[PDB]
Design a protein around this ligand. Structure first.
Ligand code: GF4
Length: 358
Protein backbone atom coordinates (compact mmCIF):
# COMPACT_ATOMS: atom_id res chain seq x y z
CA UNK A 1 0.00 0.00 0.00
CA UNK A 2 0.95 3.69 -0.34
CA UNK A 3 2.64 4.71 2.92
CA UNK A 4 -0.04 7.35 3.68
CA UNK A 5 -2.75 4.66 3.64
CA UNK A 6 -0.59 2.25 5.66
CA UNK A 7 0.15 4.92 8.27
CA UNK A 8 -3.38 6.32 8.64
CA UNK A 9 -4.93 2.84 8.95
CA UNK A 10 -2.41 1.45 11.45
CA UNK A 11 -2.29 4.61 13.57
CA UNK A 12 -6.11 4.62 13.76
CA UNK A 13 -6.90 0.89 14.07
CA UNK A 14 -4.14 -0.28 16.46
CA UNK A 15 -5.36 1.92 19.38
CA UNK A 16 -8.96 1.01 18.47
CA UNK A 17 -8.18 -2.72 18.75
CA UNK A 18 -6.39 -2.10 22.07
CA UNK A 19 -9.04 0.19 23.60
CA UNK A 20 -11.94 -2.06 22.55
CA UNK A 21 -10.26 -5.43 23.25
CA UNK A 22 -11.08 -6.64 19.72
CA UNK A 23 -9.88 -10.24 19.15
CA UNK A 24 -9.63 -9.94 15.35
CA UNK A 25 -10.16 -7.29 12.69
CA UNK A 26 -10.03 -6.88 8.93
CA UNK A 27 -10.02 -3.47 7.25
CA UNK A 28 -10.27 -2.51 3.59
CA UNK A 29 -9.66 1.00 2.29
CA UNK A 30 -10.88 1.80 -1.21
CA UNK A 31 -8.73 4.63 -2.53
CA UNK A 32 -9.06 5.89 -6.11
CA UNK A 33 -11.09 2.72 -6.76
CA UNK A 34 -8.40 0.26 -5.67
CA UNK A 35 -8.62 -1.91 -2.50
CA UNK A 36 -5.97 -2.09 0.22
CA UNK A 37 -6.29 -4.71 2.95
CA UNK A 38 -5.24 -4.89 6.59
CA UNK A 39 -5.69 -7.68 9.15
CA UNK A 40 -5.02 -8.11 12.88
CA UNK A 41 -5.40 -10.78 15.53
CA UNK A 42 -7.60 -13.85 15.65
CA UNK A 43 -10.55 -15.39 13.84
CA UNK A 44 -10.51 -18.22 16.41
CA UNK A 45 -8.65 -17.63 19.68
CA UNK A 46 -8.88 -21.24 20.93
CA UNK A 47 -7.54 -22.73 17.68
CA UNK A 48 -5.08 -19.84 17.08
CA UNK A 49 -6.48 -19.07 13.61
CA UNK A 50 -5.44 -15.63 12.33
CA UNK A 51 -7.75 -13.19 10.58
CA UNK A 52 -6.93 -13.28 6.87
CA UNK A 53 -8.40 -11.71 3.73
CA UNK A 54 -10.44 -14.93 3.44
CA UNK A 55 -11.96 -14.85 6.96
CA UNK A 56 -15.77 -14.68 7.07
CA UNK A 57 -17.36 -12.19 9.48
CA UNK A 58 -21.02 -11.79 10.42
CA UNK A 59 -22.12 -8.48 8.88
CA UNK A 60 -25.20 -8.17 11.08
CA UNK A 61 -27.22 -5.15 9.92
CA UNK A 62 -24.81 -4.31 7.08
CA UNK A 63 -26.84 -7.14 5.46
CA UNK A 64 -29.63 -4.55 5.08
CA UNK A 65 -27.59 -2.91 2.30
CA UNK A 66 -27.80 -6.17 0.32
CA UNK A 67 -31.53 -6.43 1.03
CA UNK A 68 -32.01 -2.81 -0.07
CA UNK A 69 -30.12 -3.41 -3.33
CA UNK A 70 -31.93 -6.71 -4.03
CA UNK A 71 -35.20 -4.80 -3.52
CA UNK A 72 -34.02 -2.05 -5.87
CA UNK A 73 -33.13 -4.70 -8.46
CA UNK A 74 -36.68 -6.11 -8.18
CA UNK A 75 -38.08 -2.61 -8.76
CA UNK A 76 -35.87 -2.27 -11.85
CA UNK A 77 -37.07 -5.69 -13.07
CA UNK A 78 -40.64 -4.33 -12.82
CA UNK A 79 -41.52 -7.08 -10.33
CA UNK A 80 -42.46 -4.71 -7.50
CA UNK A 81 -43.02 -0.99 -6.90
CA UNK A 82 -42.26 0.83 -3.63
CA UNK A 83 -45.67 2.51 -3.96
CA UNK A 84 -47.35 -0.94 -3.84
CA UNK A 85 -49.42 -1.64 -0.71
CA UNK A 86 -47.92 -4.40 1.49
CA UNK A 87 -51.15 -6.39 0.99
CA UNK A 88 -50.50 -6.72 -2.76
CA UNK A 89 -47.78 -9.28 -1.94
CA UNK A 90 -49.27 -10.65 1.29
CA UNK A 91 -53.07 -10.49 0.82
CA UNK A 92 -53.54 -12.62 3.96
CA UNK A 93 -52.54 -9.43 5.82
CA UNK A 94 -56.18 -8.34 6.11
CA UNK A 95 -56.05 -6.41 9.41
CA UNK A 96 -57.07 -2.79 8.79
CA UNK A 97 -53.94 -1.12 10.20
CA UNK A 98 -52.18 -2.34 7.04
CA UNK A 99 -54.24 -0.05 4.79
CA UNK A 100 -51.80 2.56 3.47
CA UNK A 101 -48.63 0.75 4.56
CA UNK A 102 -46.54 0.40 1.39
CA UNK A 103 -43.33 -1.44 0.50
CA UNK A 104 -41.55 1.92 0.85
CA UNK A 105 -42.65 2.18 4.50
CA UNK A 106 -41.40 -1.34 5.19
CA UNK A 107 -38.04 -0.75 3.49
CA UNK A 108 -37.41 2.55 5.30
CA UNK A 109 -38.63 1.83 8.87
CA UNK A 110 -41.57 4.23 8.44
CA UNK A 111 -44.57 1.85 8.71
CA UNK A 112 -45.62 3.35 12.06
CA UNK A 113 -43.47 1.63 14.67
CA UNK A 114 -42.87 -1.98 13.65
CA UNK A 115 -40.67 -3.43 16.44
CA UNK A 116 -36.84 -3.59 16.40
CA UNK A 117 -36.87 -7.40 16.67
CA UNK A 118 -39.24 -10.16 15.61
CA UNK A 119 -39.93 -12.02 18.89
CA UNK A 120 -37.93 -15.26 19.30
CA UNK A 121 -41.29 -16.90 20.03
CA UNK A 122 -42.09 -16.46 16.32
CA UNK A 123 -40.84 -19.79 14.91
CA UNK A 124 -43.29 -20.74 12.12
CA UNK A 125 -44.75 -18.81 9.17
CA UNK A 126 -48.20 -18.91 10.80
CA UNK A 127 -46.47 -17.40 13.86
CA UNK A 128 -45.19 -14.67 11.53
CA UNK A 129 -48.60 -13.90 9.98
CA UNK A 130 -50.11 -13.69 13.48
CA UNK A 131 -47.33 -11.33 14.56
CA UNK A 132 -47.90 -8.79 11.75
CA UNK A 133 -51.70 -9.14 11.86
CA UNK A 134 -51.74 -8.41 15.61
CA UNK A 135 -49.19 -5.58 15.55
CA UNK A 136 -50.68 -2.19 16.41
CA UNK A 137 -48.96 0.88 14.92
CA UNK A 138 -48.20 3.74 17.28
CA UNK A 139 -48.19 6.23 14.42
CA UNK A 140 -49.71 6.78 10.97
CA UNK A 141 -47.61 5.49 8.02
CA UNK A 142 -44.78 7.76 6.83
CA UNK A 143 -44.61 10.00 9.91
CA UNK A 144 -41.86 8.49 12.11
CA UNK A 145 -38.76 6.35 11.58
CA UNK A 146 -38.02 3.53 14.00
CA UNK A 147 -35.09 1.32 12.95
CA UNK A 148 -36.54 -2.19 12.81
CA UNK A 149 -35.56 -5.67 11.64
CA UNK A 150 -39.25 -6.61 11.42
CA UNK A 151 -39.70 -3.74 8.94
CA UNK A 152 -36.94 -4.19 6.33
CA UNK A 153 -36.97 -7.95 7.05
CA UNK A 154 -40.54 -8.12 5.77
CA UNK A 155 -39.68 -5.89 2.79
CA UNK A 156 -36.93 -8.33 1.77
CA UNK A 157 -39.23 -11.34 1.99
CA UNK A 158 -42.01 -9.69 -0.03
CA UNK A 159 -39.67 -8.08 -2.58
CA UNK A 160 -38.67 -11.53 -3.90
CA UNK A 161 -42.19 -13.01 -4.01
CA UNK A 162 -43.00 -12.28 -7.71
CA UNK A 163 -39.67 -13.86 -8.79
CA UNK A 164 -40.69 -17.24 -7.33
CA UNK A 165 -37.18 -17.53 -5.90
CA UNK A 166 -36.36 -17.99 -2.24
CA UNK A 167 -34.74 -14.92 -0.67
CA UNK A 168 -31.41 -16.80 -0.63
CA UNK A 169 -31.64 -17.92 -4.30
CA UNK A 170 -32.61 -14.40 -5.42
CA UNK A 171 -29.72 -12.81 -3.49
CA UNK A 172 -27.21 -15.41 -4.78
CA UNK A 173 -28.35 -15.20 -8.44
CA UNK A 174 -29.16 -11.48 -8.72
CA UNK A 175 -26.60 -9.81 -6.43
CA UNK A 176 -23.73 -12.04 -5.20
CA UNK A 177 -23.00 -13.91 -8.46
CA UNK A 178 -23.07 -10.93 -10.91
CA UNK A 179 -20.81 -8.94 -8.56
CA UNK A 180 -18.43 -11.92 -8.17
CA UNK A 181 -19.00 -12.04 -4.42
CA UNK A 182 -18.06 -15.71 -4.32
CA UNK A 183 -17.34 -15.80 -0.57
CA UNK A 184 -20.45 -14.04 0.66
CA UNK A 185 -23.14 -16.21 2.23
CA UNK A 186 -26.56 -16.15 3.88
CA UNK A 187 -25.84 -19.70 5.06
CA UNK A 188 -22.15 -20.59 5.49
CA UNK A 189 -21.49 -23.76 3.44
CA UNK A 190 -19.56 -26.64 5.07
CA UNK A 191 -16.71 -25.97 2.57
CA UNK A 192 -16.23 -22.48 4.03
CA UNK A 193 -16.45 -23.39 7.73
CA UNK A 194 -12.64 -23.25 8.05
CA UNK A 195 -12.86 -19.52 7.20
CA UNK A 196 -15.78 -18.63 9.51
CA UNK A 197 -14.54 -16.49 12.42
CA UNK A 198 -16.04 -16.93 15.86
CA UNK A 199 -17.70 -13.90 17.40
CA UNK A 200 -16.79 -13.01 20.97
CA UNK A 201 -19.26 -11.87 23.61
CA UNK A 202 -18.26 -11.70 27.29
CA UNK A 203 -15.23 -13.82 26.33
CA UNK A 204 -17.25 -16.68 24.81
CA UNK A 205 -17.14 -17.88 21.19
CA UNK A 206 -20.55 -17.30 19.58
CA UNK A 207 -22.26 -17.42 16.20
CA UNK A 208 -25.53 -15.74 15.21
CA UNK A 209 -28.65 -17.74 16.17
CA UNK A 210 -31.40 -18.55 13.64
CA UNK A 211 -34.44 -16.27 13.82
CA UNK A 212 -37.42 -15.19 11.76
CA UNK A 213 -36.47 -12.96 8.79
CA UNK A 214 -32.80 -13.28 9.77
CA UNK A 215 -31.50 -13.63 6.20
CA UNK A 216 -33.36 -10.49 5.16
CA UNK A 217 -32.37 -8.29 8.12
CA UNK A 218 -29.01 -9.39 9.57
CA UNK A 219 -27.98 -12.72 8.05
CA UNK A 220 -25.08 -12.15 5.63
CA UNK A 221 -21.49 -13.32 6.25
CA UNK A 222 -18.60 -12.07 4.09
CA UNK A 223 -14.84 -11.60 3.64
CA UNK A 224 -12.91 -8.33 3.63
CA UNK A 225 -12.25 -8.88 -0.11
CA UNK A 226 -15.91 -9.34 -1.10
CA UNK A 227 -16.89 -6.42 1.13
CA UNK A 228 -14.31 -4.23 -0.62
CA UNK A 229 -15.88 -5.31 -3.94
CA UNK A 230 -19.33 -4.49 -2.49
CA UNK A 231 -18.13 -0.95 -1.67
CA UNK A 232 -16.60 -0.59 -5.15
CA UNK A 233 -19.91 -1.69 -6.72
CA UNK A 234 -21.84 0.87 -4.67
CA UNK A 235 -19.27 3.63 -5.37
CA UNK A 236 -19.55 3.19 -9.15
CA UNK A 237 -22.80 1.45 -10.14
CA UNK A 238 -22.34 2.46 -13.79
CA UNK A 239 -19.49 -0.09 -14.12
CA UNK A 240 -22.01 -2.86 -13.40
CA UNK A 241 -23.06 -4.60 -16.61
CA UNK A 242 -26.35 -6.08 -15.40
CA UNK A 243 -28.87 -3.32 -16.07
CA UNK A 244 -31.39 -3.97 -13.30
CA UNK A 245 -28.61 -4.40 -10.71
CA UNK A 246 -26.92 -1.13 -11.73
CA UNK A 247 -30.31 0.53 -11.37
CA UNK A 248 -31.06 -1.27 -8.06
CA UNK A 249 -27.86 0.10 -6.51
CA UNK A 250 -28.84 3.61 -7.62
CA UNK A 251 -32.31 3.22 -6.08
CA UNK A 252 -30.84 2.04 -2.75
CA UNK A 253 -28.91 5.32 -2.50
CA UNK A 254 -31.92 7.54 -3.27
CA UNK A 255 -33.02 9.85 -0.44
CA UNK A 256 -36.53 8.89 0.68
CA UNK A 257 -36.79 10.51 4.12
CA UNK A 258 -34.92 13.09 6.19
CA UNK A 259 -34.32 13.04 9.94
CA UNK A 260 -32.01 15.83 11.15
CA UNK A 261 -28.87 15.53 9.02
CA UNK A 262 -29.58 11.95 7.91
CA UNK A 263 -31.30 10.65 4.79
CA UNK A 264 -32.82 7.17 4.61
CA UNK A 265 -32.11 5.04 1.53
CA UNK A 266 -32.85 1.35 0.98
CA UNK A 267 -30.56 -0.18 3.60
CA UNK A 268 -27.96 2.56 3.10
CA UNK A 269 -28.14 5.75 5.14
CA UNK A 270 -26.67 9.02 3.85
CA UNK A 271 -25.50 12.47 4.97
CA UNK A 272 -24.21 15.37 2.85
CA UNK A 273 -20.41 15.48 2.52
CA UNK A 274 -18.52 17.26 4.07
CA UNK A 275 -20.01 15.68 7.19
CA UNK A 276 -19.67 17.06 10.68
CA UNK A 277 -18.25 13.98 12.50
CA UNK A 278 -20.17 14.80 15.71
CA UNK A 279 -23.66 13.95 14.35
CA UNK A 280 -22.99 10.33 13.34
CA UNK A 281 -20.77 9.79 16.42
CA UNK A 282 -22.45 11.69 19.29
CA UNK A 283 -25.68 13.69 18.79
CA UNK A 284 -28.75 11.81 17.56
CA UNK A 285 -27.46 9.37 14.92
CA UNK A 286 -24.96 7.38 17.05
CA UNK A 287 -27.30 4.40 17.74
CA UNK A 288 -26.79 3.70 21.50
CA UNK A 289 -30.45 4.46 22.26
CA UNK A 290 -33.50 3.18 20.43
CA UNK A 291 -34.93 6.37 18.97
CA UNK A 292 -38.28 7.19 17.42
CA UNK A 293 -37.69 10.18 15.12
CA UNK A 294 -40.19 12.21 13.06
CA UNK A 295 -39.35 12.11 9.33
CA UNK A 296 -39.83 14.57 6.49
CA UNK A 297 -40.84 12.93 3.20
CA UNK A 298 -38.57 13.74 0.26
CA UNK A 299 -41.16 14.18 -2.47
CA UNK A 300 -40.03 12.87 -4.89
CA UNK A 301 -36.89 11.02 -3.64
CA UNK A 302 -33.57 12.67 -4.53
CA UNK A 303 -31.46 10.45 -6.78
CA UNK A 304 -28.13 9.24 -5.35
CA UNK A 305 -26.07 12.28 -4.32
CA UNK A 306 -22.36 11.88 -5.18
CA UNK A 307 -21.22 14.25 -2.41
CA UNK A 308 -22.53 11.96 0.34
CA UNK A 309 -21.21 10.03 3.29
CA UNK A 310 -23.01 6.74 2.63
CA UNK A 311 -22.81 4.25 5.46
CA UNK A 312 -24.26 1.36 7.47
CA UNK A 313 -23.37 -0.02 10.87
CA UNK A 314 -23.93 -3.70 11.68
CA UNK A 315 -23.83 -5.95 14.71
CA UNK A 316 -24.59 -9.43 15.95
CA UNK A 317 -24.02 -10.69 19.51
CA UNK A 318 -20.40 -11.41 18.63
CA UNK A 319 -19.56 -9.17 15.66
CA UNK A 320 -19.26 -5.46 14.84
CA UNK A 321 -19.12 -4.19 11.27
CA UNK A 322 -19.06 -0.82 9.54
CA UNK A 323 -19.06 0.36 5.95
CA UNK A 324 -18.78 3.95 4.72
CA UNK A 325 -18.03 5.55 1.37
CA UNK A 326 -17.95 8.88 -0.45
CA UNK A 327 -18.93 8.42 -4.14
CA UNK A 328 -17.57 11.79 -5.35
CA UNK A 329 -14.12 10.97 -3.89
CA UNK A 330 -13.99 7.31 -5.05
CA UNK A 331 -13.21 6.60 -1.40
CA UNK A 332 -14.43 3.95 1.03
CA UNK A 333 -13.76 1.80 4.07
CA UNK A 334 -14.90 -1.53 5.49
CA UNK A 335 -14.21 -2.47 9.10
CA UNK A 336 -15.03 -6.04 10.18
CA UNK A 337 -14.48 -7.19 13.77
CA UNK A 338 -15.39 -10.29 15.77
CA UNK A 339 -16.52 -8.28 18.78
CA UNK A 340 -19.58 -6.07 19.12
CA UNK A 341 -17.96 -2.77 20.15
CA UNK A 342 -19.62 0.68 20.36
CA UNK A 343 -20.80 2.31 17.13
CA UNK A 344 -19.28 5.77 17.87
CA UNK A 345 -15.80 4.18 17.96
CA UNK A 346 -16.41 2.67 14.50
CA UNK A 347 -17.57 5.97 13.01
CA UNK A 348 -14.69 7.92 14.62
CA UNK A 349 -12.05 5.56 13.20
CA UNK A 350 -13.67 5.52 9.75
CA UNK A 351 -13.89 9.33 9.65
CA UNK A 352 -10.29 9.66 10.90
CA UNK A 353 -9.13 7.42 8.02
CA UNK A 354 -11.30 8.78 5.18
CA UNK A 355 -10.80 12.43 6.17
CA UNK A 356 -7.00 11.99 6.01
CA UNK A 357 -7.21 10.42 2.54
CA UNK A 358 -9.82 12.71 0.96
C1 GF4 B 1 -30.33 -7.73 14.77
C2 GF4 B 1 -30.76 -8.19 16.16
C3 GF4 B 1 -29.64 -9.05 16.68
C4 GF4 B 1 -28.34 -8.63 17.30
C5 GF4 B 1 -27.88 -7.22 17.54
N1 GF4 B 1 -27.63 -9.74 17.61
N2 GF4 B 1 -28.38 -10.86 17.24
C6 GF4 B 1 -27.96 -12.13 17.41
N3 GF4 B 1 -26.69 -12.41 17.76
N4 GF4 B 1 -26.66 -13.81 17.84
N5 GF4 B 1 -27.95 -14.30 17.51
N6 GF4 B 1 -28.77 -13.19 17.23
C7 GF4 B 1 -29.54 -10.52 16.69
O1 GF4 B 1 -30.45 -11.32 16.25
Amino acid sequence: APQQINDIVHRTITPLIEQQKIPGMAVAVIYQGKPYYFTWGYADIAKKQPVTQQTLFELGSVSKTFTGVLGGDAIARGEIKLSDPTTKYWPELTAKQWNGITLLHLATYTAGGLPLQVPDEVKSSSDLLRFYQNWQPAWAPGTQRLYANSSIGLFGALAVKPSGLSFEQAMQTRVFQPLKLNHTWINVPPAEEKNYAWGYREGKAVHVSPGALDAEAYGVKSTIEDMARWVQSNLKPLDINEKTLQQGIQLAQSRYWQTGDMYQGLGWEMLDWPVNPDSIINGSDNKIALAARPVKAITPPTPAVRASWVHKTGATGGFGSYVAFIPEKELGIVMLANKNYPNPARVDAAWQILNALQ
